[PDB]
DNA sequence: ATCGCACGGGTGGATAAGCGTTTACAGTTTTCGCAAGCTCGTAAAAGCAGTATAATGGGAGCTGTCACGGATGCA
């Protein structure tokens, strides 16, 4: 995979609602990774590594 | 021819026993030969204690992403 920034989905990952929940993703050549991603609630969070 | 029969001589035959001669199958004596084991000696291996300018908090390349269920365990 190519480095660079990333945006993807998921389809039925919370099978009680049936949302779709968008991410976004940073992937660099070397160092750490970085997603921003949501939650059914609609707020936004980070995970780092 | 031709041939037995007999008295008797010579023997052959069956054990048996004889003779001097050169090695067995019994048992010990002798010497020589080389070890396997013990004792030893020391040069090598093995182990131990110390070294006084000053020195004071890792991360160390890890993981790169699969997704589905059950039980667990806080809240």
């Not at 609602?17 to 750490?32: D, E, H, M, Q, T």
Request: hydrophobic share 35%; glycine share 8%; no cysteine.
């Amino acid at each position: 995979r190519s480095p660079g920034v990333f945006f993807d989905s998921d389809k039925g990952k919370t099978h009680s609602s049936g949302k779709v929940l968008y991410n976004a993703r940073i992937i660099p050549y070397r160092g750490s990774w970085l997603d921003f991603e949501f939650d059914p609630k609609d707020n936004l969070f980070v995970r780092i590594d």
